[PDB]
Amino acid sequence: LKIEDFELHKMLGKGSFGKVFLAEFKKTNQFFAIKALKKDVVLMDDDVECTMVEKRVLSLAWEHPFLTHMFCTFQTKENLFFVMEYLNGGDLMYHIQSCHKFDLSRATFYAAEIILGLQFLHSKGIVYRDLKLDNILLDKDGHIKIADFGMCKENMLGDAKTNEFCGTPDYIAPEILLGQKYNHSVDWWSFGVLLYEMLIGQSPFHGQDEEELFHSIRMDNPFYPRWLEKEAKDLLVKLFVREPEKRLGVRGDIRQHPLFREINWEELERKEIDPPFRPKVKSPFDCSNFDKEFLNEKPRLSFADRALINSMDQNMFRNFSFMNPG
């Protein structure tokens, strides 16, 4: 379409995902989140293939309820734009800061929806690789939304393996740290780290610097507090198996774990289960549920290196455009 069809109200955030704005369709008064990338910055960072994978993965996302939905993708001479579902309900990291840890039934419900979201991605041959509490958003009813598909690997059906060193320090799998070829097993390790943090309110591994933390991930036994529910410990013990082919999620059937005894997986995937908690949100402009760091910055697209833009190959971002049905 055209970015002029939108009024950019706020910068929600800025970072490894580029820039994301609170945007209103002029015109209809519907609010969206818009991820904006500079094409010259993408080429400098050597991230052209990254951008295309993210767009292709986001193209599939409307098929599942627990992934952030993308409505459309379009480009300018300088810019790439992704028009997304707007979620101001807050991320799980932000929410956990207030309460320290989630109660067992709340953590169990988030774990179960994340399982459904991850298993959907793996069935499409996608390894997600960036699972973390910051990437889990709440919709207005309190169901989860997995966000940020910028680290995904795309052709991972059956026996397929990859090699890249990708992740966030606390959540990175030991097989990545040992330089091994890996599959979706790494997502189930990160899932364990995320579950552990929800239940306990600390990371399972520790170190004063990245190096000591990597050693902890490879060597240490996570601490399980005396009060922790038996089945919750048992699930964690089964995900924190360092041999990938023996980890729950890769082997066995994680849905059948006694922790999820009371989960009807069919009803959950249809959103027929009452969320344990619902964010309080007065309007699209209510920013009570997320980090306010960038909200007073002018909601502007910054200047590009005109020289690089007018000289670069223009067809690197072809097949970028996409329209979600209706």
Ligand SMILES: CN(C)C[C@@H]1CC[N+]2=C(C1)/C(=C1/C(=O)NC(=O)/C1=C1\C=[N+](C)c3ccccc31)c1ccccc12
């Ligand atoms: C920063 N983090 C805790 C998250 C993830 C940070 C990752 N991320 C979020 C998420 C995110 C979304 C989204 O899909 N729908 C959103 O409303 C949205 C938000 C909302 N908020 C309020 C927001 C702040 C900064 C950046 C992005 C976003 C998004 C879109 C494209 C690429 C990466 C993201």
